[model samples]
Target: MIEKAPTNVEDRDKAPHLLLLAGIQGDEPGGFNATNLFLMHYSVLKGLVEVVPVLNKPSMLRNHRGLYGDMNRKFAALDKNDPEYPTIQEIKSLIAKPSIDAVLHLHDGGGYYRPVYVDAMLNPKRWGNCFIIDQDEVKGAKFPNLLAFANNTIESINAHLLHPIEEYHLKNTRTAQGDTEMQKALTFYAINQKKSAFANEASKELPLASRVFYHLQAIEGLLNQLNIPFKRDFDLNPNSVHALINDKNLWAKISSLPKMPLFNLRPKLNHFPLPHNTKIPQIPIESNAYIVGLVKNKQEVFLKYGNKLMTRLSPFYIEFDPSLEEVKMQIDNKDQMVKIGSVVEVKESFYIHAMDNIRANVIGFSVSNENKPNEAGYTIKFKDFQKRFSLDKQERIYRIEFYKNNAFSGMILVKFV
Candidate 1:
């Protein structure tokens, strides 16, 4: 995401941009989560700062260390035949742009790294919980004194660290001098281009919250050194970190399950087809805000809002027929009427009650209501729902639609607790 603080042309003249990247290694979720939290929690105010949170989403989805190949190593020489070439090529173009002043790579390393060996976890060969730079300085770049800056960032983060051993340190890989794999690294490539490049590693030994805490401090420290001004939604403390991380539980907004309507969404009942609509409630966090239906055999749909996997909706197939102008139903025994476009909210369980001039048609459910004048509608219970039209996953959410006078109407979503 691009964060350009100077909105107008007059203010734009003074903006210096920094590029931030995370999750080159799909297995290291801490870096990507850290960047994602930053996006959710703060706004860029001083110079332009851009973040690439998931550089390799294919690798990320499977939670593997690499997809196709280690993306970080592909910076120096890329293979056209590689599947990762698309993004690899794109990032190189972005880096080449003149506006970018510095590029920082973020990672959750193997273990704590130290200048002098203290123990097996903190040794000369380890890489975690350290501020990594390619060299002490790049002769003429902005903030050329990388040594001093690294030490400064370490000091700032250490002051707030949870433990002394968890303290941050500077690791000058001196990639150009040796370390063949390091020579192909992204940060080293940036140095070759005359742009200030560095990396931050938060130890995998720590939980994601602690990792994120260190990452933000390091990032903000660098931004501050670059004279960038900013604001934060939270304080840089353990409590704030814990709160933010804990809030990430998926479906946290959903309260209870048993009482919600569609607790028994069957695809068909007896013979009548259950009608459904593909719309999900437009929650505030969604980026696309609507389903662009998934392709057959495709199980995952990426959600740009909070987490990628969340976009992977619980899938079931049904014909969406909006058969009315409005719908009348009982949600959790509470009577309510709604326009076809409005969403019907529910917590716990709800049963669709018989209503005059309205018929509730659940997708994947069938009933024996044949021209019966007395029967306004019917409700499906847990056992009956599971017997037929179930996707076989007992605890799945379902959709139910409404039909009025055999014309298009509205739909409701049943979110299970």
Candidate 2:
């Protein structure tokens, strides 16, 4: 039944609107119809336009019983002038609403392997309303308004889509259907499997978390280079961070800390006298870890021999105050104990353990580039260490190891560090 409605006198009141018509023929619902609903709901949330969803004929039977009479086919054969054509007349009347801007008819059929969109239909040309139609295998030609609307719809869906893992599983378990060999293979390899081949393929097909993180880190690094403030948080507790930043001596001695039984047990039978107070072991608090101290002086030395050194051999050097007159004596001499406030430079050669690590045969030795010292230590820049590495964007933890010459100097593996 059509009810009389007030007429809108303003153009703004009769703005572009959408009419979504879904075919619900039988017990089996149309998948494309559901997709239309998804798009409609998304559009509504964006407040882009209004949508009116219409079910053409709700009483039509479905599945095996519905197929016996083919009511839809019979209706299609009815002439436009036929008074008995109730469904066609209703559709025409619905489109005549002043607020109705466009109509979308959705249905489902077999033998289709892809989605399709149709920009116009014969009825729309005759009825004088611009229309776009989408089907299972064809996409509509580009139109300015339609493209803009579609882009917005895509962005909305992408922005609100569930996490990849959840989406993958949801699609596999709820949507996959058919009995063809390819379909059977897909069902077997669906993302719902504990270790899905489809999921693995998807991983290979898309940019991974690590790759994304690497780019983000590069962006953050650029921001830092431009003197912008950057904030980073870690999931680790304070204790873990502290332990990682501390000296190697503390790590070596950590095993010596006292341990106590985690639980206590008592006999079920009543004891004659209460047991003496249990003595808890005293745990040692680790302290006084050794840390690297920067040399106060900077000076260069010449090697006696010009020959290249072995890559793995550890080299040593003597240090002296810049004012010391005995500089020449320190170079040729061995078994000298370098004192505090003295400067020394070593050139041991080393090979990188992995592609990510650094490796170089020492060509020469010189004073470090750091001229100033902060509370933590002197800042030294190594040109060779600038190569980029990738990591996960969501990863809250990382580790960095520093090597001086051929020897391990320090490491940063915890949050605070």
Candidate 3:
């Protein structure tokens, strides 16, 4: 999905316009994550930053570099019936726009790149931790002094490197002079169109958090060089990047199944119930999140967050009751009218409002003194539930499943945090 920051016309025209593209190769999630976090936080004051955070949705869902074929190569030539034809056309159209001053393609390349062969992992042939350019200059293009611009940004990247070996170097492919592989790449296409284009490669050998950190740093450096004023929500550090990417509060809601939002789920939730013979809709989560349905061995739903597997849900078919749509509850002593397929945060305690003929079964929770089947009227706390029964690995989120006359109605998640 493409999103434009500071859509105001004058603001866009006042400064250089940048097209930040990521996830063109699905397995390179560092770029995707960095772009998502950049979109989530950064605000442009003078320039318009257009972003296509997840460019290859199908490949991302499958967690492969290319589902159909190498997407980057398709820019140079492709069959009209190819799966990525439409996307390549769209990207070409965006680059051709007169207002686009530059384009930044993000990637996670293999190993560390050095000028000469040091080892198998660190060599001149490797692509990672490098600022790549098709040529040293494109005379008619904006920011035409490619080498100068790259040097400035590489210096900025080195300043924040976790280790000296992780430093970024400039890799001039000299595409116009006969770099066959790169001539078919996105940056080369942008260069041919006379628009300043660059690509940053974070090492795949590094941890995801570290890769994201490096990518963000490279982006910020480029933004600064372009004189595009912007700000982000978090500090640029490995620890902060790690925390934000793996935040427990990130949530995703499925169209079918129990219909409650899923976040911080365990690695595997076995035998979970789903509606019979129903078509699943797109998940209304982050644009990067994808759902993979597996039919062999077990009917499993795999939720993918970028290139990482967030959770696995093994399912069993069941008929659902759609009679009840909402719920009444007191969250932290305050009355709240929460939807059935929603999550409610409780600080101290919560009490579900009693309803006639509806049984409120707070899964993982029970009363100590009495054998009460209905947990509707009582105030519930974190201590009331068994830690092992909590839905997530953190043991903070629990399910409140409702039933109407022995038919499953819906569920609401209660997160005590």
The most accurate candidate by lDDT is 3
Q: Compared with the true structure, what per-residue lDDT tens digits does model 2 show for residues 1-417?
A: 211121322333322333333332332223122322223222221101222222322222112214333323432245665443565555545544544433333333222111222233221112111111111111222121322332333333333222332111101212235423223222122112211111111111222222222112222222222222323332222233333222122211111211111111111111111112311112121222111111111221111000111011111222211221111112122323332212233232112122123221111112355422111221222222222210112122122333333433322221111
The residue pairs found clashing in candidate 2 are 26-62, 115-136, 116-136, 116-137, 116-138, 117-138, 117-139, 117-140, 118-133, 311-349
- Which candidate, 1 or 2, has the higher lDDT? 1
What is the per-residue lDDT of model 1 for residues 29-103, given as tens digits with 9 covering 90 to 100?
Answer: 778877776766777665677788778765676667885878988987777888888888888877767878888
Which ten-residue region of model 3 has the weakest summed lDDT?
A: 288-297
Name the weakest run of 10 consecutive residues (lDDT summed) in model 1. 288-297
In order, candidate lDDTs are 0.64, 0.24, 0.80
Which number leads on TM-score? Answer: 3
Q: What is the TM-score of each predicted model, taking all chains together?
A: 0.72, 0.24, 0.84
Score candidate 3 by TM-score against the native: 0.84
Tens-digit lDDT track for model 3 on 55-149?
Answer: 88678767888989899998887899998899899999998789898889999999899998999999999999999888889889878998888
